[PDB]
Amino acid sequence: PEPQMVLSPLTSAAIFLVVTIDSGGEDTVRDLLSDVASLERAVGFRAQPDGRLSCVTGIGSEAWDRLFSGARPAGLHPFRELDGPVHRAVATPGDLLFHIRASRLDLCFALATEIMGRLRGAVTPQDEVHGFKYFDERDMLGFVDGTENPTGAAARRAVLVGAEDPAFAGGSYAVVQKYLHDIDAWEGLSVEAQERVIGRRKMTDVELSDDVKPADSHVALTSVTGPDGSDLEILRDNMPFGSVGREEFGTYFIGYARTPEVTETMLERMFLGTASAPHDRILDFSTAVTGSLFFTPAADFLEDLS
Amino acid sequence: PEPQMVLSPLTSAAIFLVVTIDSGGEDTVRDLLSDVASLERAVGFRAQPDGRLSCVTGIGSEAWDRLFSGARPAGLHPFRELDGPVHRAVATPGDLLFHIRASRLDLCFALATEIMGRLRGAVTPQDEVHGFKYFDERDMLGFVDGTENPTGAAARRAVLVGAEDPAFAGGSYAVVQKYLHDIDAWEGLSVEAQERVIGRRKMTDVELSDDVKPADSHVALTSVTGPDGSDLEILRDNMPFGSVGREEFGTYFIGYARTPEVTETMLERMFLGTASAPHDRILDFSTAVTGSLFFTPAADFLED
Amino acid sequence: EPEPQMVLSPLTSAAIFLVVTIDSGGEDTVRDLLSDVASLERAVGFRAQPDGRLSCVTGIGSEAWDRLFSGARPAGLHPFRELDGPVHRAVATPGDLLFHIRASRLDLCFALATEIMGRLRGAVTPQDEVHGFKYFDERDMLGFVDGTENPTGAAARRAVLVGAEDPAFAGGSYAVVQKYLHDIDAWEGLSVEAQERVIGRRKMTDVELSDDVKPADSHVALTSVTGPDGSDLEILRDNMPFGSVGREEFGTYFIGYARTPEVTETMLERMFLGTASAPHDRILDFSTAVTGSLFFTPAADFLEDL
Amino acid sequence: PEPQMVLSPLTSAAIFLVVTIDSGGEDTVRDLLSDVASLERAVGFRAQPDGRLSCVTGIGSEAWDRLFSGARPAGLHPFRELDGPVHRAVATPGDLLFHIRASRLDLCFALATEIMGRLRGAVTPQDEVHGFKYFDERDMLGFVDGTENPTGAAARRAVLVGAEDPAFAGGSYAVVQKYLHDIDAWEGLSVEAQERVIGRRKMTDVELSDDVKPADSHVALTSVTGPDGSDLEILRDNMPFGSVGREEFGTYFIGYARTPEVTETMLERMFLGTASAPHDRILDFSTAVTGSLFFTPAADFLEDL
Amino acid sequence: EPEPQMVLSPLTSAAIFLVVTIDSGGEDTVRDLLSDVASLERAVGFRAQPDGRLSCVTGIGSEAWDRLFSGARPAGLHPFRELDGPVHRAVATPGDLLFHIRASRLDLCFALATEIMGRLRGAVTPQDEVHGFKYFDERDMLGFVDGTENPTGAAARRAVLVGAEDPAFAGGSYAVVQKYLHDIDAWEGLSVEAQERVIGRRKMTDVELSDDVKPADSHVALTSVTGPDGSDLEILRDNMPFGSVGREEFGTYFIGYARTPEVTETMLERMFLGTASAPHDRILDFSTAVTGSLFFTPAADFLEDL
Amino acid sequence: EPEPQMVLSPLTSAAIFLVVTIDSGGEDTVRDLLSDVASLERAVGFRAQPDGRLSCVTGIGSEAWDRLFSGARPAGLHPFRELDGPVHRAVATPGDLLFHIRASRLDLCFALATEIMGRLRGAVTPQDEVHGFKYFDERDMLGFVDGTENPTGAAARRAVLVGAEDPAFAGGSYAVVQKYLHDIDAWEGLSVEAQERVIGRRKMTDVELSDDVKPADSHVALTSVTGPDGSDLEILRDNMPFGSVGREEFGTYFIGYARTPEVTETMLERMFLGTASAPHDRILDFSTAVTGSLFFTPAADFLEDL
Ligand code: HEM
Ligand code: HEM
Ligand code: HEM
Ligand code: HEM
């Protein structure tokens, strides 16, 4: 099975586009999905080797049933609202996800324009975020973001559907959440207190010792061992965004995994808490305003459609 | 006189910030003015030499009178609305301009964050535009944009206030206009019809010969000669922007000159027309939704 | 595992194409050089790594093969088949060895070509030498992006490498070369839209024309071929511009690789002889073929073991 | 099994650290080995993609028995001294090797600093070398260095333990030796004479033909064929080092192989010679002052401590 | 107030040299092209800035100047003087117009030479067209570093630009071109040390030989010249390798700018005719000149003011 | 207009600092070396351009100057003056010559230092050799951004280069060197906020502390000097980390250039001896000076003609 470009080289810009499919618009979308690889080539081929343009296309649970009449990926379902004592993870509408990445924003934008040109009249926009990484892989909170993502054989193992669902091998599951930060409150904490929130040193990105690492740190709560005691892993490509005039400072979260169960367990521990921790401390400075789940099929699945 | 970095190396990203100054906000504004070059260094230095971060700071006519006593720059006035027979150039409020450029959007955003943090509670934002150039210096209409800009000595002569206004030497004048395009209409033309609207070939960027160039093409209307037969020139750094979901496809125009009279003459020919040309044909596919005029002082003016 | 030559190279901005004939008695000298050409590639290119991307693909013609080797031949190896169309003609021209030398810069290409030719002096006569250069946005001298629909990854390997259908030669490939010259004055008299009707794709944005407007005699229409089982028959091209401004010579050096020459040959038949819906490829109304040769590129270990 | 970054992309800088483990030092060392991959990601993640920072950790024969219980790598023994008729390959103490590579020296230095801060009080330094390659892949003797290193599947076959030692599949063996050069004597040869020493042309890095190449040239002696005629290969990442004030000009040698017997056979041919060569002529300009052998486990083995 | 042409360019890895003669009646088409050549430079190169580094230096020969312009001539403009020495000669070959086109990539050079010759069709006849490439470590075809002792900065401007001695043509320069072909076979028969004695520098490290052991007939010794006041006389060279492996053509294109041709001419006289202590420059026993022409390269506003 | 040495350099990531004393009888050998150092700079550097960015700046001490030359002396040239403060002391150590060698790669620095030391063998005694490396984001050993407030452009020229006030030495500068050893254990024990109060800038963002909170004993406050008129007195710094992890040596090599040494000396006095508001520079509680010397770096042409 040939996968879509989930395991991409590092990129400094992205566009995330989420849409809903209007009544009667299904045949226009099917035609579009069968052409999306060919559009990615047309826009990116002339800009190699430095443009590094890729699009990952994802389909939600309700959209799947409208578009395809056969079998359904095993793990695919609507994003599941989490209502904890203090923090909530909302569910917002999303039928299609276009996760466009490149080494610059104009390549991302050219691709988006062609895609949405083909879809006009058949879809309704729900969200559009222009992302940009900091020059040292930092997010809006000032911390390095990405360090413990898996790489190589490890990332493929964690991210790509295999034997457990063989008609959908080479697919993945993506969860997306747009988070807005309370930057005034964050910058009133001392460096050392911010380090207890995250679980790693700020300037040098060293993990705090097991003896100092609080139970309600982000790193403690997103660390999960499986039945066999091996680490459970996902691949993130979080992107800063915002608008200085409106005081909007953001992290767009996106996590890929071979089954949503892994990403859903991490979210459960963040929002609902554990025996030792009420919730992830990062949520006292971060509000979720979207939540959607998408299956990203293998590339040949998309090509062989009508 | 040390100028601001009006004369910048080429940049692929930019943020344009326009704000109005709240009543009582005058002292906080003046304090940031005196620090803005120090902030520029602080953000930019550790990302050198590839970041190419600069900030150009401009001040409007009405704001100048509220900030400073003594002399006014001789050409500082509010943007003059143009009401043409078909097309119109609107004037819109603005007291300060921040023109921030770099090789990456994140550097721009960092600097804009620090400036705005210092101004909180003293200003009201009017416009914020994040621009990106396409990888071949093309604009939203598909044409190369920037080709005829002056360079070196010619650029300094065209852009920097000199001996005619000695107190303000090394300053310049900036005119901004945000345009929105009718991309549907534009893409309905043949390439050869588009060429005749701009005045140059699409793929090769060669100027159309004078026997073929229409009187109402953009290059024809914006070509202006002065008394001595010299070309009157400006320096532009137009930037694409937009949003695919709202069908917003724009060009942010910014033009620097040594006196606003040059830019204003070009604008009159475009919007009002001449004897041979009803108006700039680029306007049949471009609507202006802002318009403002600023003076960008010499750097040591700000330091003091 | 028979190691293939570098048929599947990363993107390169420079090439030398060298075609020679082997003189009476030159066989021995040629055999010794063939066994050394992988060492020479390492010697010249190592000290420019990692940016250099220096590779050499060596090719052997049908007549030469019989002169250098005894026993079994590749199943598909014959001389290039002249095509005599009602209007257009594909010529066959002499060539026993092909050196296809690529790199991120022309000096690496030239220095390898000097080592090779040094060793063969007295054994071989030059028939063609072409120094190619890519435009900065992957365009050809006709103004179009060139290479977009080439296969990549596993798809590329399947299309270009000999497998179980001829196991003794597994890991080889077949290369066809033609040098074309372009009548640029006649081309530049067409409107952009008329040019796009000849190729099959939009000029600036390299988007494929819709199946409703694509003419049957366009380039892209005639070089799209499906097999009996409905699979796409694909080749890998690395077309390079070349020329001389003084002599008004503006050219494309065509090179295509495939696992069997039947695929390339079917597409040349379509272009020069036409189908029921199309007299010939309209790209030939502005392009003249002046050379044409067919070569087998053996697996690397075949060459080493000499 | 996931190997360490033996098979690195080319790097222009490196730091070679060799230490011994003091009395009582075992626990501190085991704790650090469990964290080293995490430290390498910590230092290097924010400098990607240009940093190319990696760290290969090696453990010596005596140390292995102090640190771990149970099975031992089959090839793992202390470095074997060779006392030739003219030249000697010495053996010197070393328990742990850190091979730090990157595009720039500061990244190498930052990692070293975090590794050694954790080890302070547990270990004694034996050798610290800051290496820098010349901009055209040349060594201190002025020759391109690295040309015939295997690449790809060829390198994985030559370097990585597999089925012959299944408990330790994915590791490798490393020999290091520090050489000091006599540059004044080297530069007194003509280019042509130097070419005869090495076995390759100096400017063009083309190998001399088998008819010209002398029997005692470096390339001739370090070309070995197995039982089947097949070439025996090692991966090398030799690095220049020195100090202009003390007149120190060096090559730090480092060779990786699936079994030490390949590298040990090459050292025998160089220091003791053959029927047609007395010794490797490179050794008349090059003196070994350290020698140590180490096994570099698969990355998963370290993680699991 | 003088704006020079880009004689003092940054280092560039590609060049095209085009020398043409002006046909009878073509004077007016040439004048109109000279007035547009800066515009053409911008058209081609602007969209590849800042990495492209495209420039064109236009020069005009002595006989052509009197056909094209009326009034004053630059003081040192005369035809190249043939040098007939006892062994080696410097030929004088025809040439009305030079276009020295430089860039970081050959395609930018080609595009610009295409536009120029497109407007000159029917008015000029081509005499020479060379496509130069850099070796990665600034070497020439002889394997020595080429450019080391060129002036830079303030020294360069003083060495190259016409000033108050000829004030109507201030900002101009004088260019001398010679195409050389090398006898590579003979050169490579020398020992490295003997090659060093021909040039006067070490090969590998490019350190100048000390004044006691540097031969008097070494390249460096005969091109080192001191004035009446004892100060060095300098020129600015941008020599470029070129060649064709098939035809055994290994070359250096010599191009040297100076504020007055007397400086370049004294160098050539020393090389070809010799001194009391040197018969001729040893480099000439391995290098044959096949073209020789002299041009005046006006200030930039001189061309556009037409 | 004299030509300065390369005091105003583009940013470099590596450096070698070499400080030697001249042995009795060694004078002539040193003078010969001085007349060639620029030539050696070009020999080593030209083939690596333009990324190599190799430069060397040569300085001469007070006592060495009168041993080497007859006639005039630069007005501000004198031995480094010892500062014996109540707590901290700035030592004077011997040094006759300084080579400040910079490039993008340490190997280029080492190659140039090899040639220079090769020429001086037997006539000089080395006193200090340091190999420096800057961190990827322009930080120093203390983990702060180091260089921010250096003057650029014309202001740099005016600050650093001797002009009309000492006309025979115009285009010269003065260099003060101090090798510092840090107590990194003590440093890393401070919170980030307390380290910010030592330096007087934010650690992550490098924004200067506002004047109401900036301590009077911060490094930035003590090294901020206005002159008679109320103009800011500036120097040009190029400080370089160095060390050895095995011997626990973590250092900053200070070098500072200025047109007259009184500016550097005033800053040093405030650091070590304090003011009415501040006992000493707090950076010295974590920093110990183990070398100290002053040099004149004459104009390049002075060196040439000698
Ligand atoms: C406000 C939103 C978020 C921010 C700013 C954020 C930031 C970060 C940071 C700075 C780290 C440390 C360095 C590293 O990437 O390894 C990290 C680690 C991590 N984050 Fe997030 N995060 C966010 C949301 C989430 C969410 C919603 C999930 C899961 C559904 C998640 C999963 C993880 C995981 C798994 C790790 C790696 C921990 C480890 O194994 O060491 N994050 N996050
Ligand atoms: C409305 C959106 C605009 C777009 C998309 C646009 C685009 C262009 C393009 C594509 C060129 C040709 C290449 C070049 O020399 O840059 C050009 C030239 C020019 N534009 Fe615009 N332009 C716009 C607005 C303006 C306005 C408002 C003014 C003046 C006030 C201006 C003044 C000029 C000038 C002076 C030139 C140079 C003409 C010459 O002498 O060759 N443009 N512009
Ligand atoms: C004394 C310092 C050493 C220096 C300066 C040095 C230098 C070189 C040079 C220039 C080459 C030629 C190019 C190449 O890398 O292929 C080379 C090749 C080689 N060296 Fe060394 N070498 C040293 C020590 C060693 C040692 C100790 C060994 C082995 C124990 C060794 C094994 C090899 C191997 C196998 C090759 C490749 C030979 C081939 O197949 O052609 N070297 N060395
Ligand atoms: C076959 C043609 C040529 C080749 C391959 C060649 C090559 C070289 C080389 C390798 C150098 C030493 C490094 C450096 O560039 O400084 C050199 C220097 C020089 N060449 Fe040539 N050259 C040629 C023709 C010429 C001609 C025709 C002239 C003058 C008309 C010339 C003038 C110089 C000058 C002035 C130097 C600088 C000498 C000094 O002051 O150190 N060269 N050339």
Ligand code: HEM
């Ligand atoms: C241990 C030695 C040193 C270290 C680690 C160090 C580090 C720093 C840092 C981080 C800065 C702030 C950013 C900057 O503008 O570059 C700074 C500024 C400065 N340092 Fe140092 N420095 C050291 C010694 C010195 C010494 C010895 C002097 C003078 C004799 C000096 C003079 C300055 C000056 C003038 C500034 C700029 C102050 C301003 O105007 O903003 N420093 N240094």
